[PDB]
Every structure is written in structure tokens, then in C-alpha cells.
Symmetry: C2
Subunit: 231 residues, 2 copies
């Protein structure tokens, strides 16, 4: 879309199967069954309050862009800029209550088998990022994956929140620069979240494949999820 036209948080800039495939009807997963979010794509997952969701780094080096919205109101969402002052920390650890843009609990991070490195600072990739990196034509991207995954449940975001970039390792070094590093996750590492409200979670398997880190571009792969019922 030409920049003379207004920005539209809900409008995808292109298409992939995220527009039409859902993990299960209504995003309501069967409990204790593993589902796979394909490489380069996003999916939405409904959770009832008290349920838990495992997100598993299936192949070990993949970044997962993670969002959560209140059921019935995409205008209230897990909010990185509210998360940080509430915890007085840049990124969450197991036991931390993660808040919405109303500063109320929306999720609790319960487990993290990795060394605990994640990024809360960086926007989701989008077509403008790929154009800036030299790419010709459409590139799959996390912002479009969010839009499509929500759209497949009949939902439209009114803003694109900052993702929680699961397993992304971009530390801030002395002097204020952000330094690209490879992930420190390993195959099978997981995080576990508990829903503190009824929510819609969205996860995008980031398709970034144009940024050499330590001599090699990322190679987009899938992520696994598994829902645990409320006891």
C-alpha cells in the first residue's frame, strides 16, 4: 500500500496458508496433543483461563514471535512496554506475571528450559524490513502472519503490538548498541505460559532468512505447541 494511504493494522501485505488454515476449529486445541505451526507461518490458539501452553523449539534455533489478546477484545493485549516497568526487568523469567496494556495479568511465564534469552525490544518483521534488506517482491513476515492468523478466527487487530521474540538473542552491550548473536536455545527447548484471562495467543515462526549472523542466515523452521487443560 502506498504511503499516501493510511496504515491499517489488520490489512495483510500478502498471503500464505496462514490466511486459511487453522490448527483446530476456532483455535481450540485438543489437550495434551502436539500441533505444529509451519515454518514461515502463524497460527492463533484460544486458551481458557487457567490453561497452559507449551511452545517448543522443534529444531532448536528458531525465533517465535508471540502475542496474546484478550478474548473478545483485540484492543487489550500482552504489552512489552507495560511488562517491563511492572517487572522492573527487560525480559521475563519463570514465575513472572506478564501484563496487558491495562497493567493486569494476562499470562504467567511458568517454565523456560533454555538459558532464558528472549527479546522484548524489537518489532515484528514486515514487508518494509525485507525491502530495506534488499529483497525483491513479497516476503513472508511476522506482522502479516499475525494479521492472517487472527483473521482466520474472524478477528482483526486494531494495532500491531510489539512481539515477545522467543529465543531471540540480541543483547544490548556497553555503550547502548544492540548486538546480533545466534540463539542459545537447543532442540526441544520449551517455554510454558499459563492464561490468566481467556485469551487468543498468536505465534509466528519468523521467516527471517536474509540476515547473516556469525556467517550464516537463519533457516526458518517450524514450532510445536501443546495445550494443557486447567486442573
Amino acid at each position: 500500500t502506498s504511503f499516501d494511504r493510511p496504515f491499517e493494522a489488520a490489512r495483510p501485505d500478502g498471503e500464505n496458508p496462514s490466511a486459511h488454515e487453522t490448527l483446530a476449529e476456532g483455535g481450540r486445541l485438543r489437550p495434551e496433543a502436539t500441533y505444529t505451526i509451519p515454518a514461515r507461518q502463524g497460527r492463533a490458539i484460544r486458551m481458557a483461563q487457567g490453561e497452559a501452553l507449551m511452545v517448543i523449539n522443534r529444531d532448536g534455533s528458531q525465533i517465535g514471535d508471540f502475542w496474546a489478546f484478550v478474548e473478545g477484545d483485540c484492543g487489550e493485549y500482552l504489552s512489552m512496554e507495560h511488562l517491563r516497568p511492572t517487572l522492573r526487568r527487560v525480559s521475563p523469567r519463570p514465575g513472572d506475571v506478564l501484563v496487558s496494556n491495562r497493567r493486569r495479568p494476562i499470562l504467567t511465564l511458568l517454565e523456560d528450559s533454555s538459558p532464558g534469552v528472549h527479546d522484548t525490544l524489537v518489532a515484528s518483521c514486515d514487508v518494509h524490513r525485507y525491502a530495506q534488506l534488499g529483497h525483491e517482491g513479497y516476503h513472508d513476515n511476522c506482522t502479516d502472519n499475525l494479521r492472517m492468523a487472527l483473521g482466520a478466527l474472524g478477528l482483526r487487530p486494531t494495532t500491531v503490538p510489539c512481539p515477545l521474540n522467543l529465543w531471540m538473542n540480541t543483547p544490548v552491550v556497553e555503550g547502548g548498541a544492540m548486538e546480533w548473536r545466534p540463539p542459545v536455545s537447543r532442540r526441544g527447548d520449551h517455554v510454558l505460559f499459563r492464561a490468566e484471562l481467556d485469551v487468543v495467543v498468536v505465534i509466528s515462526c519468523c521467516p527471517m532468512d536474509l540476515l547473516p549472523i556469525n556467517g550464516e542466515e537463519a533457516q526458518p523452521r517450524a514450532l510445536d505447541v501443546r495445550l494443557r487443560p486447567r486442573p
Copy 2:
């Protein structure tokens, strides 16, 4: 508003003179004249592409919450989570082009007479923050100031972006904690921004007055602004 009702980015939670007073008609300041944004309040300022805006820490210790929106489209705005990966830095320095949520230039930071400490990580204060700190009844807050200042020009935001928290000194220390510190600004310190598009800037003189740092609460004071014409 009860949390059973949806979040509304444009709806103020209370009132102060920001709802009805503007610095000048339409936010169009007379060039090279100093205007004062009162303590605890916000104001909107229109800028044409190529104009510059000085923001002056009138009394020296005040935090200014700063936003910018594209003229004609509050859905496109100066975006902290896009600013950071574009600069590969946590906070901007003079010479840095600051981008919108479309990753295009919206402002350039031209000058900063302070030591250069600002925060891009923390949400604007809101009624929920003050309730969490123990406050009874309405408290002035930056999120409401944003809403009111835009409303006084006939504008309604569709999301509350993260502010740039001018002169806020909350460094991230080894281990990942954020540490409260007093500002390092001095009386008369300024920043200068150039508009790279026609924009609406909003500045809130943060009314935070309940958080003791180094034994003393902040004491909200005013901020000064001055517009420079396009040469």
C-alpha cells in the same frame, strides 16, 4: 471503565485543562516564540516537514513523554520498537533518523545538550499505574494527556504508542534489572527534532509524583517548546 468493557485508546479516564486548551490555534505555533506546556498536562504541536522543534527542560529534572503522529493518520506514529532495530541501539543520539511503524523516517534527532540519557522502554503512566502505587481517586497521567491533547485538535488515536521518555534515567544493569535513577539533565537542557513528514507531536509533562528516587519524589514542573521554520 470496568474491564468487562473493551479498552479504548482514545477514551480519557479523567480530565484536566489539556482537554480544552491548545498552545495556539490548530497546534500551529508562531515561529521562534517560546510556549510553555503546563506541569502535569499535555499539548499537541503541528509541524510541517522540515521544521524543527526544541523541547526544553525548563526547570531541569522533568520527564517529557513524547509522541509523533503522521498528519492525517494517527495510525502511523513514531514507534519505539521500530526505532530500535533500525538504529541497532536502545535510545537515540543526535544525527539519528527516528522511524515510524512503517520504518520510514518521521523525525531526526538533531541536538541534545544533556548527557544523552532517555528511556524508550517504558509505557506512559496511566490510571492503572497510580492505582497500583496506592493512589485514591483520579491522578493526572500521560496516557490521558495524550488522548486529551489529540482530542483538542479533533484527533483520536487508534493505539497508545510507547512514549519516548525524554530525560528519564532508568538504566538496565547487569543481570537484566531496570534501576531507577534521578535524571542527569540540568535546567535549560534541550533536545531538537526535525520533522521528516508533516506531523502532530504530543508532549506530556509527566505528573509522576509518588515514586521516591534517592529519597525524594519527583515534583512535576512544566516544559518549554519553540518551533523553528523550514529554511
